[PDB]
Design a binder for this molecule. Structure first.
Ligand SMILES: *[C@@H]1O[C@H](CO)[C@@H](O[C@@H]2O[C@H](CO)[C@@H](O)[C@H](O)[C@H]2NC(C)=O)[C@H](O)[C@H]1NC(C)=O
Ligand SMILES: C[C@]12N[C@H](Cc3ccccc31)c1ccccc12
Ligand SMILES: N[C@@H](CCC(=O)O)C(=O)O
Lengths: 339, 378, 239, 279, 101
């Protein structure tokens, strides 16, 4: 870790160590890294004008389902969809009744057509009255199809969201549990926030017990799904958010900070450095570099696409076609049989 | 053991506000006071015995507590309530687009009348002076089919004028279908899925035995309400006693498993339960009005009055933004109830039945026309 | 029967007429009747002088008490009990005794009703009409193109009907293509026509969008609280 | 409907026809001793896309029925296609036109034939910076310079100016506190020349470090968030904005219309080609 | 209540400064103990619900009538007017065309 001031064993008083203490120690005269800039550190050392302004967000998210079998299913499950089809066939019997006191294959086929707009040829029964049902059954068939389409769109409604993104103001995050296996990096600046925030003491410990030595393991836990949530500053996190998109960042960056080089006090260069990085911003260099690396990564937003899933039922249909034509040799046998 | 919550936070406010040091412990016998025979039980007992000066908690207010002791704050709104995981379904398929019916249905009949005029133009063209005359009847049946999503083999009209007139009609039919589906599109919204139970007056609660289906409502033992129930419906209280549970999670699980049909409790807590549900399958009744109106009250020795002095500090606290901070701090609840919306993979079979009833009516009508031919006049 | 009580009334809308006898009834009146019957006491009701609920006023001449409106009247001893939608608060509780609340309520904001939306014909103008004019014209040209070759080696009306068959979706089927090349032409154009109507089904889809986001105003988050907009006036009841 | 249109649906449709074509010729020939042509192609066409096809129906029992099943499923897909496009209609990013300024469109107005317009307040750190790095922008924008932020706003709001450029905090607050939500922060409002408010001191002799400490104390206390909500709060929270039933100035369907015209031309020269086959 | 009786008026959604109603008496009133006990009894009994329900329930505002047809359908009237107008010209014109050929 970069390191934080901590109790030195029995002594209980010690330098922040890590990257910074080496700096106090003089092992490294100047520190170049992605270091957030904070007052607790600031008293000890000089800091350059912050290079970046990154804010803490929570980098996590898992898969969001989209049923392959859901759209037709609206019929399947209803079960009045199939049965009524058969009753369309039954209407033929009523028509025969209409015929009385004024072909079965053609009728059933005719019924199938209204579901499917077959327009085969013969048309409505001789009785005008009988034909009225044709209008009715096709009416309802039409309605059903359209209604289905509307319910197909009801599936499209989607709009079921986990909505656990706002951790700072989020109810779930505040009252931690075993369903909130939450961490940060062992010895991370946010720990200072939890430390100083007695308001967050609960969370401080809740967090502490799950902390990691590094980001690679911390990101992995969420990826491995070992830990449901991960907390870290955005600049490190968002790039990863782009990198996978299996994981997501949520809520509003909190505790904003500037990035500035860490160096031992009195460095006669820090001021020049500050001017230099200032120029880097002024000339667009800083800006040019940030686009240069971050820009390379990108992921899709909340845009919906069909993705060739639901098409398999039709695959089934084509398989049924094969079965059909196989049956067809026996159907022609029937003509031959009446030989 | 450490303690948490907004009451705890209020107590912190009170350390500073009334400037009084306090000792806090937990009750053993009976939780919220329970009165059996000669002697009362719970925190109220420790308030009566002089062990406790003031009792704090989720305790509800009642007249009996009032004769014995008092609370002058009423900080929160709570009432008896039930959480039901239920749903709302479409009725009559948007009444078969009833709105079109006031103007649209008549116009359809009117549309048929337009068709007669079209046929009249057409008849002359067809016969300046086999049996195409069936076309007008066929055209109406034929025109009607073209109106709804085609799917009519019908007959082929020839008269030149009919093709144009048909096109004007077809255009109409198409845009009709557009509006139809827009009506259908609007319905997707109408497929509102909100819990379908009534308040305390509902018959499912009042006369549970009559329904064939087996369902039961219940509440926690030794509660203030038991008495209300016994002072509302004694029989209902006995039924609740038969199916008694004890912990929140008992009820919760029972509700999630369906072991318990629905559950009544202090709404405030139940709201908080909705505030903490995993999966969001539980809701309040209708709007959530409990139908029992009360707020939390804090005990004081009947002789004791720091409450009158205490009251002043409390109100400004009401006025102060923090109560809402405490609300946001502890009462914030996930999945705010925006008029809820959802999509069914089972579609609607009872709405479908409604459709089928219309269908069945038509079948009956055709039987009537059969009868007319059956008994056709000489 | 709606229970009513005679309540002394103060000044009317018309000039003067401060002294009057009037009729009172409603939620609070039914509550009074219940309380009176329950505790067995008789009463006389009157409407508060100066029409106010009650607030103390600090410095009009000498320092003044919470004698404003209805509340002060009580302080004077003229009123022995206040029976109205009187909010229980710290300020008042310091001087009088409030019963346990008979109603729990919170402040909200009242504003005029929101504006409506246009009819479908009006809706059609934004997308349907221009396309219909342009495309309808396009169909005739397509019909003419197939014939060109056919002509080389009411036909036009028949072609239009064939092309219109797609649009209305009437599919009158009055006429069929003359040649295999036309069919490839039909294969070309027929598919295009199908796409055009499917895009019309996209137009069909477009009708549903007319959903309106509208607006709501936050108690503290909204800009209006942030500034009493000069153009946007808001207020409450005095005293 | 682009993924479905891309591979599986068309090939399957050919197979159903082909299966029917084999069966129809054999079966039909079975039915009548004394054919799949373009008409069959139209049938794939008739069943597949909302009917409207008048050419033919095959005279056989097994295939015709199988296709009616296909058609029914295909209708579902059609319906879904409508829904797919409805999904597009559900929301839209009405922010498409963006001037990055690293694009060079701003660099020159003159490249774009209509005159473009953008301006900023003079005597600003922004204007001085502009003059330092980008001269042409300064020399051009001097005409579009405005008296005051309310007046600069007058140039944007009432028309007669397209874009306005100013400090990001003010522009963000302005976006929130605005009569019309039409104005929106550029992109994510992610600003170049990333800076913050600066507090002056005299020189190396001053409050120095003790003063800075206080500042980062404020972040720890969390007061700034509250003060942000109170003073910096903004109207019309910036959710992904959406538009519905917009003038249909198709652009991709226009492309489709062109596809049509081209395909026609091909078939016309195909007929010529065929004709020549003869000579 | 007002918003439920006058459909041209509506409330802002947020509820703030939660507060509640009570009977007011001087601190030394001998009816204070009695007045509350009565209020509590009326809440528990249901008397309070009868009064609120009796008076408040009279009026409600709903979104009933959906969206299909109605006002949107009025221009459809125009559409219907457009179908009838077109056919008449064709009569004489069509007859003239027939006479020509
Ligand atoms: C920035 O503001 C200063 C001061 O207002 C401007 O300086 C004045 O420019 C005007 C030009 O009409 C002269 O008449 C004055 O003599 C200048 N001094 C003043 C008025 O104090 C300056 O021009 C502005 N920046 C620009 C537009 O160059
Ligand atoms: C042409 C149409 N016939 C059915 C149902 C319907 C409903 C309203 C308008 C149009 C249609 C259909 C499905 C998918 C696309 C287009 C349509
Ligand atoms: N709410 C009271 C009593 C329960 C009830 O009203 O039934 C308690 O916490 O014990």
């Amino acid at each position: 870790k970069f390191g934080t001031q901590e109790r030195v064993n029995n002594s209980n008083a010690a330098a922040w160590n890590g990257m910074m203490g080496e700096l106090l120690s003089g092992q490294a005269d100047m520190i170049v890294a992605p270091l957030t800039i904070n007052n607790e550190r600031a008293q000890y050392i000089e800091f350059s004008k912050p290079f970046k302004y990154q804010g803490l967000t929570i980098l996590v998210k898992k898969e969001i389902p989209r049923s392959t079998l859901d759209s037709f299913m609206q019929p399947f499950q209803s079960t009045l969809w199939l049965l009524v089809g058969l009753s369309v066939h039954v209407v033929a019997v009523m028509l025969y009744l209409l015929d009385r006191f004024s072909t079965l294959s053609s009728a059933m086929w005719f019924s199938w057509r209204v579901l499917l707009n077959s327009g085969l040829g013969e048309g409505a029964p001789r009785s005008f009255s009988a034909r009225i049902l044709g209008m009715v059954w096709a009416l309802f068939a039409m309605i059903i199809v359209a209604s289905y389409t509307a319910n197909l769109a009801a599936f499209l409604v989607l709009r079921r969201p986990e909505e656990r993104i706002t951790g700072i103001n989020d109810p779930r995050l505040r009252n931690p549990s075993d369903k909130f296996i939450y961490a940060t990096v062992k010895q991370s600046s946010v720990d200072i926030y939890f430390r100083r925030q007695v308001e967050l003491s609960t969370m401080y410990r809740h967090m502490e017990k799950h902390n990691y030595e590094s980001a690679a393991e911390a990101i992995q836990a969420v990826r491995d799904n070992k830990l449901h949530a991960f907390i870290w500053d955005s600049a490190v996190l968002e790039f990863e958010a782009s990198q996978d998109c299996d994981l997501v960042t949520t809520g509003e960056l909190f505790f904003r900070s500037g990035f500035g080089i860490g160096m031992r006090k009195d460095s006669p260069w820090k001021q020049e450095v500050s001017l230099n990085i200032l120029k880097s911003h002024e000339n667009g260099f800083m800006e040019e570099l940030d686009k240069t690396w971050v820009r390379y990564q990108e992921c899709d937003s909340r845009s919906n696409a069909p993705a060739t899933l639901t098409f398999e039922n039709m695959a089934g249909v084509f398989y049924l076609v094969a079965g059909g034509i196989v049956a067809g040799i026996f159907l022609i046998f029937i003509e031959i049989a009446y030989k | 053991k450490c303690c948490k919550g907004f009451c705890i936070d209020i107590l912190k406010k009170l350390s500073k506000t009334v400037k009084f040091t306090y000792d806090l412990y937990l009750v053993t016998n009976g939780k919220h006071g329970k009165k059996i025979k000669n002697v009362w039980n719970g925190m109220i007992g420790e308030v009566v015995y002089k062990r406790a000066v003031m009792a704090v908690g989720s305790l509800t207010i009642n007249e009996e507590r009032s004769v014995a002791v008092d609370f002058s704050v009423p900080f929160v709104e709570t009432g008896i309530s039930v959480m039901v995981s239920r749903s709302a379904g479409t009725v009559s398929p948007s009444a078969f687009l009833e709105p079109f019916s006031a103007s649209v249905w008549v116009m359809m009949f009117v549309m048929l009348l337009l068709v007669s005029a079209m046929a009249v133009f057409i008849f002359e063209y067809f016969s300046p002076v086999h049996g195409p005359s069936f076309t007008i009847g066929k055209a109406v049946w034929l025109l009607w089919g073209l109106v709804f999503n085609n799917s009519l083999p019908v007959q082929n009209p020839k008269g030149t004028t009919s093709k144009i007139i048909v096109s004007i009609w077809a255009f109409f039919a198409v845009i009709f279908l557009a509006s139809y589906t827009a009506n259908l599109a609007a319905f997707m919204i109408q497929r509102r899925f909100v819990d379908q139970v009534t308040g305390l007056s509902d018959n499912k609660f009042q006369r549970p035995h009559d329904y064939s289906p087996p369902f039961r409502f219940g509440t926690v033992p030794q509660g203030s309400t038991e008495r209300n129930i016994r002072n509302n419906y004694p029989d209902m209280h006995q039924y609740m006693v038969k199916f008694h549970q004890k912990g929140v999670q008992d009820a919760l699980v029972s509700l999630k498993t369906g072991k318990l049909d629905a559950f009544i409790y202090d709404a405030a807590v139940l709201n908080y339960m909705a505030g903490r549900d995993e999966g969001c399958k539980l809701v309040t009744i209708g709007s959530g009005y409990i139908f029992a109106t009360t707020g939390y009250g804090i005990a004081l020795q009947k002789g004791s009055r720091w409450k009158r002095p205490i009251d002043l500090a409390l109100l400004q606290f009401v006025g102060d933004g923090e109560m809402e901070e405490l609300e946001k701090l502890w009462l914030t609840g996930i999945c705010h109830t925006e008029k809820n919306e959802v999509m069914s993979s089972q579609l609607d079979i009872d709405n479908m039945a409604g459709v089928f009833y219309m269908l069945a009516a038509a079948m009956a009508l055709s039987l009537i026309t059969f009868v007319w031919e059956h008994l056709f006049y000489k | 029967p709606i229970k009513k009580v005679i309540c002394n009334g103060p000044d009317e809308t018309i000039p003067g007429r401060p002294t009057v006898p009037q009729c009172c009834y409603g939620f609070c009146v039914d509550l009074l009747i219940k309380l009176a019957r329950e505790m067995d006491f008789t009463y006389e009701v009157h409407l508060v002088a100066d029409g106010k609920f009650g607030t103390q006023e600090r410095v009009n001449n000498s320092n003044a008490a919470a004698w404003n409106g209805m509340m002060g009247e009580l302080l004077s001893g003229q009123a022995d009990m206040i029976v109205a939608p009187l909010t229980i608060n710290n300020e008042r509780a310091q001087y009088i005794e409030f019963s346990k609340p008979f109603k729990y309520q919170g402040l909200t904001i009242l504003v005029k009703k929101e504006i409506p939306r246009s009819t479908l014909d009006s809706f059609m103008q934004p997308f349907q009409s221009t396309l219909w004019l342009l495309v309808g014209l396009s169909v005739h040209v397509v019909a003419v193109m197939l014939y060109l070759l056919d002509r080389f080696s009411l036909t036009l009306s028949s072609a239009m009907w064939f092309s219109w068959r797609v649009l209305l979706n009437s599919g009158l089927g009055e006429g069929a293509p003359r040649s295999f090349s036309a069919r490839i032409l039909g294969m070309v154009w027929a598919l295009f026509a199908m796409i055009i109507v499917a895009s019309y089904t996209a137009n069909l889809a477009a009708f549903l969008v007319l959903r309106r986001p509208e607006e709501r105003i936050t108690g503290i988050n909204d800009p209006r609280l942030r500034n009493p907009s000069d153009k946007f006036i808001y207020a409450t009841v005095k005293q | 409907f682009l993924e479905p249109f891309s591979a599986d649906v068309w090939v399957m449709m050919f197979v159903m026809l082909l299966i029917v074509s084999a069966v129809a010729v054999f079966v039909f020939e079975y039915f009548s001793p004394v054919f799949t042509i373009g008409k069959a192609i139209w049938l794939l066409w008739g069943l597949v896309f909302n009917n409207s096809l008048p050419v033919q129906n095959p005279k056989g029992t097994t295939s015709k029925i199988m296709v009616s099943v296909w058609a029914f499923f295909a209708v579902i897909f059609l319906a879904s296609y409508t829904a797919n496009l409805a999904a597009f209609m559900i929301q839209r990013r009405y922010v498409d036109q963006v001037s990055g300024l690293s694009d060079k469109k701003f660099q020159r107005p003159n490249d774009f034939s209509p005159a473009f317009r953008f301006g900023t307040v003079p005597n600003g750190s922004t204007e001085r910076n502009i003059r330092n790095n980008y001269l042409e922008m300064h020399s051009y924008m001097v005409k579009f310079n405005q008296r005051s932020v309310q007046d600069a706003l007058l140039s944007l709001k009432s028309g007669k100016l397209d874009a306005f450029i100013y400090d990001a905090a003010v522009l963000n607050y302005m976006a929130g506190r605005d009569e019309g939500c039409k104005l929106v922060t550029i992109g994510s409002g992610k600003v170049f020349a990333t800076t913050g408010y600066g507090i002056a001191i005299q020189k190396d002799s001053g409050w120095k470090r003790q003063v800075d400490l206080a500042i980062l104390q404020l972040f720890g206390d969390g007061e700034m968030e509250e003060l942000e909500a109170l003073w910096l709060t903004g109207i019309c929270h910036n959710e992904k904005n959406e538009v519905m039933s917009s003038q249909l100035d198709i652009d991709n369907m226009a492309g489709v219309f062109y596809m049509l015209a081209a395909a026609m031309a091909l078939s016309l020269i195909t007929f010529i080609m065929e004709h020549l086959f003869y000579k």
